[PDB]
Design a protein around this ligand. Structure first.
Ligand code: FES
Lengths: 86, 193, 53, 168, 295, 77, 119, 54
RNA sequence: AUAGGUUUGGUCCUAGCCUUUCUAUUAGCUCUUAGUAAGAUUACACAUGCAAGCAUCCCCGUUCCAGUGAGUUCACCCUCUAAAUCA
């Protein structure tokens, strides 16, 4: 658990590292700020002009538990229990 | 066990006593419930003070008598509300007993109501899509004839004295089962004052 | 899918209806009245008080 | 992870994103697509992705599919009146097909808005009763009324034990 | 033909909208509310501007100004006055025609009094019932205590005037007495404390100007605009004052003399403005900044 | 409540009813009041029935309904 | 459910707690339980005065017209409510009761005046 | 005459539509034949006692 | 589940059983006293009180309500069309 926790966090790609890799602005959309386009990172190098192709159907492998809860199917009597502040 | 800050509960949190015991962390930062297991009970203790007797490990509020949960003590109240979501923590979150959490809840609402505590006030839309004032509800309704003449809306509302022959007819029918004849009723209730 | 026919129910149903016609009580039997107790002996019912006289 | 290729197709959010709600006339939809042939690429993508979306918004329409029965991919709709509607879909992307059938056999935005208004009228904000159907249950949940004897015991005057002690 | 221009006049609103301003940050300020993890998109420069353009337009809808209404006239109209019902009852009987289709304005709320008079309910009483039976989010049946003078002073001391207007707009109707009271009282605290910037880029700016123009108290607001290098906006404010008071010495004089720019401001500054010295002095410190740019 | 197979309590066997005494003044006035009252009601009820029957007819085969049907039918073709 | 005889009736469904009644105007059947199944709820009635001293009688008058137009009957207390509202004429017996009360109170002043005269 | 509330509503309907006619709206009670309460009813619709007294 | 304890001389991987959380019933020990909500284990026997009458005779009601959960895809939709209510 420790050696994996530190490994996952070590491969954590930053917003500017992303902007540089894709060469495009990384725009944050916050529901608490409406459609305000907050630019968190921009490519310091040359910016690109071709809109990244938006694939209508994303070929991402979802996790069943995530979708299970999203659709209100996970009813664990132990999840979201009142606990002391951490 | 009386507090000098009873009347000015805002002063304790400003004094150096507070700033030495707590500093910048909330008063509940160092409270750990004592409980069986790894998952705490979902309800905290009812009250830490029973008949002026303090329990073993008193909650944050009940271990310092100088902490008065008043709608005026805005600083204390702020500690028990999210600084990011504007929500009152649950009692298990901070460990304040059931008694104090309810008092706190009232205090939070009172300060918020009185304008002492800041909270998000959303921008709402108008109630009515159309503001036209052409409907009769706002216009003038033609008064009814009976209303104009101050008459009972329907004629049979008023008392109509029955004819003598008709009145006598029923006396024949209900012989031996008759009440005292009643004259015209008083127009205004003769309610004895 | 199919329901067991309630046969005895139907038998008694017809039987009862028929037997009522055969044993129809007459007006002289239904609407008789005892002028002493003021009660119809057929059903032992007391007529209303406002009809006694 | 979730099983299958493109697992998103098996999520309610994806199934509720269908924009083709057939009119009440449409009863049976048959899809005669080919499995191979570059020309029919759009036809099979429609069956892979959208038939799930169509059948969801239209749970009573019988969707039927046939592979390699004819040289050309084509749809056909059977309406209640008896009119059948051949939609040739060769050399046409799945999203184009999705919008074609929406145009010729889909409800307009006005019809959908009207249906949504009907649901609004079912839940009348004033109707008091179980929160499964209403907002409030009693009228003691309205501010400034007579509260329930549970939370705040009512004055002995109002209670039928001490006003009966005054009656008797 | 020429009629007293009302606020809703498109000519008028356009002016007031320009003066309001569109501070995107202020309109879409982060809120203190149940937060959810943000989202991210990779946007080309062109796409970023389109995200801005659609964000601009959305803010316009947000800053749409409440229509100023004249205080509603109390409804005092009876229907029946039966004397057989006098003394019979001890309580009122408010009858609300709850119906989904009826517009709240065009609703029938009648009351049977103990006296027996079948009246129509007061404007106040009506709104109470609309809420009881058609609860709106953010509206309360009992007047919140924050609207008391003691509590409003605290809200003003904290520079929370914009918030008070949102509470007042949600609780009370635009034509209610209570509404106008709070509406105007707020404008006063702002004027006395010179906090005209607090309400800028909000949907309440127009209502703020409309109040001041009708009281001939545009001085402070006009000064502020000049101090913030908003001459173009200041001129529009002076123009609006002229249109709403055509039969004035300054209004006709400017028309006859076609005064514009600095000349237009000075004439009103010396003649009518009660802070001419300060306005002239404002246009004199401005003169220093103008001289530097010219140099 | 009791069924028809349940007998009458021996206690209540002898129970004869008692005629409520009648005030001839109230009786006649109330009798006339009821007459007019129940007639105004019967008048109102019939009026609402016409409205209900009209709403069904107009929605089913009314001019506005028939135009919408043709509008959709013309659009369909 | 199918009842063996009955008609749609507009009645008051008794809710609330002990010593705290609250009625619900409901279009039900002539044979359904008082608090049982109903076809449609046509408003409510708070029989106890609120903080402002009034009785709160919401009435879905639009729908009341439709149900009466289909044959809906009305219970005695329901008729009297529409009277006090003004949708229907005042109930006949309502008036007769006021008269009886006033004639009882006529007797009362005769007796009460005597009490004050003595003491 | 119409009852209090109904009259107030009918008027507004006329006014709202655009009808300015102030003709007092009323009913047609003449059509309603108020039959006497003691009028002989149809015996054909009346029931009959069963052979069983119960 | 934010998990924890338990295989072994020990370590990993699997794995079951338990623990911590929330209810309801019954017991033990306690159980000052105010409101409200609920309250046979048993479709096994009952003391034998009380719960269907009202109405100028007919008619109408007593087939509803209130119970129980023994049996059990006859409860919801559609098509036809009864019996009621709409004088
Ligand atoms: S819940 Fe309202 S009376 Fe009890």
């Amino acid at each position: 658990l420790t050696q994996g926790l530190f490994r996952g966090l070590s491969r954590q790609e930053t917003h500017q590292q992303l902007a540089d890799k894709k060469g495009l602005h990384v725009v944050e959309i916050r529901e608490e700020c409406g459609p305000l386009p907050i630019v968190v990172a921009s490519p310091r190098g040359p910016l690109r002009k071709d809109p990244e192709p938006e694939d209508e159907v994303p070929d991402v492998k979802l996790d069943w538990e995530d979708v299970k809860t999203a659709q209100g199917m996970k009813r664990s009597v132990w999840s979201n229990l009142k606990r002391a502040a951490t | 066990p009386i507090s000098p800050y009873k009347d000015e509960p805002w002063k304790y949190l400003e004094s150096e006593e507070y700033q030495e015991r707590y500093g910048s962390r909330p008063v509940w930062a160092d409270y750990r419930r004592n409980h069986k297991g790894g998952v705490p009970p979902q309800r905290t203790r009812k009250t830490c003070i029973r008949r002026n007797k303090v329990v073993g490990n008193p909650c944050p509020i009940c271990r310092d008598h100088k902490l008065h949960v008043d709608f005026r003590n805005v600083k204390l109240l702020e500690q028990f509300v999210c600084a990011h979501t504007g929500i009152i923590f649950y009692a298990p979150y901070t460990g304040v007993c059931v008694k104090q959490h309810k008092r706190l809840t009232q205090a939070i609402q009172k300060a918020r109501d009185h304008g002492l505590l800041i909270y998000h006030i959303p921008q709402v839309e108008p109630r009515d899509l159309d503001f036209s004032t052409s409907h009769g509800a706002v216009s003038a309704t033609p008064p009814a004839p009976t209303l104009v003449s101050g008459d009972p809306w329907y004629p049979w509302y008023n008392w109509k004295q029955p004819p003598e022959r008709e009145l006598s007819r029923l006396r024949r029918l209900y012989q031996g089962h008759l009440q005292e004849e009643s004259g015209p009723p008083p127009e205004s209730m003769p309610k004895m004052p | 899918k199919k329901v067991r026919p309630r046969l005895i129910a139907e038998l008694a149903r017809r039987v009862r209806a028929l037997r009522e016609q055969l044993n129809r009580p007459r007006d002289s039997q239904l609407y008789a009245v005892d002028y002493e107790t003021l009660t119809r002996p057929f059903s032992g019912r007391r007529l209303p008080v406002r009809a006694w006289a | 992870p979730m099983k299958g290729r493109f697992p998103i197709r098996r999520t309610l959010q994806y199934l509720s994103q269908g924009n083709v709600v057939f009119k009440d006339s449409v009863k049976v939809m048959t899809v005669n697509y080919n499995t191979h042939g570059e020309l029919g690429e759009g036809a099979r993508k429609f069956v892979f992705f959208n038939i799930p979306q169509i059948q969801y918004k239209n749970p009573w329409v019988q969707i039927m599919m046939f592979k390699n029965m004819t040289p050309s991919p084509f749809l056909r709709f059977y309406l209640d009146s008896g009119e059948q509607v051949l939609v040739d879909v060769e050399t046409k992307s799945n999203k184009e097909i999705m919008e074609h059938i929406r145009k010729i056999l889909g409800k307009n935005e006005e019809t959908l808005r009207e249906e949504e208004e009907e649901k609004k009228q079912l839940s009348h904000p004033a109707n008091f009763g179980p929160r499964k159907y209403c907002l409030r249950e009693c009228i003691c949940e309205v501010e400034g009324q007579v509260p329930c004897p549970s939370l705040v015991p009512l004055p002995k005057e109002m209670r039928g034990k001490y006003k009966a002690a005054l009656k008797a | 033909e020429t009629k007293k221009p009302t606020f809703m006049d498109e000519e008028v609103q356009s002016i007031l909208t320009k003066m309001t301003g569109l501070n995107l940050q202020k309109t879409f300020k982060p809120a203190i509310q149940e937060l959810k993890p943000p989202t991210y998109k990779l946007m080309t420069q062109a796409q970023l501007e389109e995200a801005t353009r659609q964000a601009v337009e959305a803010a316009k809808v947000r800053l749409k100004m409440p229509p100023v209404l004249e205080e509603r006239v109390p409804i005092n109209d009876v229907l029946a006055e039966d004397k057989i019902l006098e003394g019979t009852e001890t309580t009122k009987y408010v009858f609300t025609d709850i119906s989904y289709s009826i517009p709240h304005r065009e609703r029938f709320i009648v009351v049977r009094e103990p006296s027996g008079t079948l009246r129509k309910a007061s404007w106040e009483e009506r709104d109470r019932m609309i809420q009881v039976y058609f609860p709106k989010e953010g509206r309360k049946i009992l007047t919140p205590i924050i609207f008391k003078e003691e509590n409003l002073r605290t809200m003003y001391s904290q520079d929370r005037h914009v918030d008070v207007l949102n509470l007042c707009f949600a609780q009370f109707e635009p034509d209610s007495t209570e509404y106008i009271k709070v509406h105007h009282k707020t404008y006063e605290d702002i004027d006395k404390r010179g906090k005209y910037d607090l309400l800028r880029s909000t949907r309440y700016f127009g209502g703020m100007v409309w109040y001041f123009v009708n009281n001939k108290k545009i001085d402070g607001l006009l000064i502020d605009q000049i101090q913030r290098d908003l001459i173009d906006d200041a001129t529009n404010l002076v123009q609006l004052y002229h249109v709403l008071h055509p039969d004035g010495q300054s209004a006709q004089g400017a028309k006859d003399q076609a005064a514009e720019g600095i000349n237009l401001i000075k004439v009103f500054a010396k003649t009518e403005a009660q802070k001419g010295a300060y306005i002239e002095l404002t246009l004199q410190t401005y003169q220093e900044a103008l001289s530097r740019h010219s140099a | 409540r009791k069924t028809r197979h349940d007998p009458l309590a021996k206690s209540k066997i002898e129970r004869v009813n008692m005629p409520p005494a009648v005030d001839p003044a109230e009786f006649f006035v109330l009798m006339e009041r009821y007459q007019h009252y129940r007639q105004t009601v019967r008048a109102l009820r019939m009026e609402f029935v016409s409205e209900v029957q009209r709403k069904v007819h107009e929605a089913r085969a009314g001019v506005l309904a028939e135009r919408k049907a043709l509008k959709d039918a013309a659009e369909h073709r | 459910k199918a009842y063996r005889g009955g008609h749609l009736t507009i009645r008051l469904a008794l809710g609330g707690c002990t010593n705290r009644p609250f009625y619900r105007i409901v279009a039900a059947h002539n044979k359904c339980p008082r608090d049982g199944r109903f076809v449609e709820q046509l408003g409510s009635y708070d029989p106890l005065p609120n903080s402002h001293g009034e009785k709160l009688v919401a009435l879905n008058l639009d729908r009341i017209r439709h149900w009466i137009g289909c044959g809906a009957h009305l219970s005695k207390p329901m008729e009297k409510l529409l009277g006090l509202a003004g949708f229907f004429p005042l109930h006949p017996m309502m008036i007769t009761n006021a008269e009886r009360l006033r004639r009882k109170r006529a007797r009362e002043v005769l007796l009460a005046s005597q009490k004050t005269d003595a003491e | 005459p119409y009852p209090p509330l109904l009259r107030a509503m009918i008027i507004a309907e006329r006014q709202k539509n655009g009808d300015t006619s102030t003709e007092e709206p009323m009913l047609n009670v003449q059509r309603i034949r108020m039959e006497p309460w003691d009028y002989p009813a149809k015996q054909e619709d009346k029931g009959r006692a069963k052979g069983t007294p119960v």
